[PDB]
Amino acid sequence: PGFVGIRFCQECNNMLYPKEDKENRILLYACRNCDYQQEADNSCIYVNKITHEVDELTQIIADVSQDPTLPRTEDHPCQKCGHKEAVFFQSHSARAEDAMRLYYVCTAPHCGHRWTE
């Protein structure tokens, strides 16, 4: 599935809480500070992923490729730009080092391509 974000009351720049409408059995994000209501786009209001399988590829930024302290490799090239040199590194985040996974970011500038073998 996917996460569901904040619905914003735009005119007073505030939060919207989902409350039910019983006249037609629908869900309506209403403001508590003022009177502003929006239809619920989806039935999911709250979701908790407990397995902690988050996209570490999106978590990792591409600026780490130019760091000299990180080791450099040439075994696997960049897929999009074809440059041979990649940087292999770990998660560096908690509750992940139980499985040490390798992430390659291409050292070629202006491509910014990262991938997992």
Partner 1 sequence: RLLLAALGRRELDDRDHYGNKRLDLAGPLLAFLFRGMFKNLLKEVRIYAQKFIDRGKDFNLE
Partner 2 sequence: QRIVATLPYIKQEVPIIIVFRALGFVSDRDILEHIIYDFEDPEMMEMVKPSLDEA
Partner 3 sequence: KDILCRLEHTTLRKVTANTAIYYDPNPQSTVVAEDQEWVNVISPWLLRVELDRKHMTDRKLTMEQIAEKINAGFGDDLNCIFNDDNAEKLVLRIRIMNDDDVFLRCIESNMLTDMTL
How far is it, in rounded angstroms, from Cα 117 to Cα 112? 16
Any bridge partners for residue 38, and if so which? 29
Asked whether position 24 contacts partner 2 by CB under 8 A, the answer is no
Per CB under 8 A, does 99 bind partner 3?
Answer: no
Q: Which stretch binds partner 2 (CB under 8 A): 21-29, 46-54, 81-89, 102-110?
A: 46-54
Q: Which residues, including other chains, have CB under 8 Å from residue 67's CB and lie 6 or more apart?
A: 87
| Angle (nearest 5°) at CA 23 between 21 and 29 | 15
44 is in an annotated binding site: no
Among 22, 42, 43, 46, binds partner 2 (CB under 8 A): 46
Q: Strand, coil or helix: what is 59?
A: helix
Among 48, 75, 99, 100, binds partner 3 (CB under 8 A): 48
Site string for Zn ion, 17-36 (x = CB under 5 A): --------------x-xx-x
Whole-number Å distance between alpha carbons of 24 and 97: 50
Residues contributing to the site for partner 1 (CB under 8 A): 59, 92-95
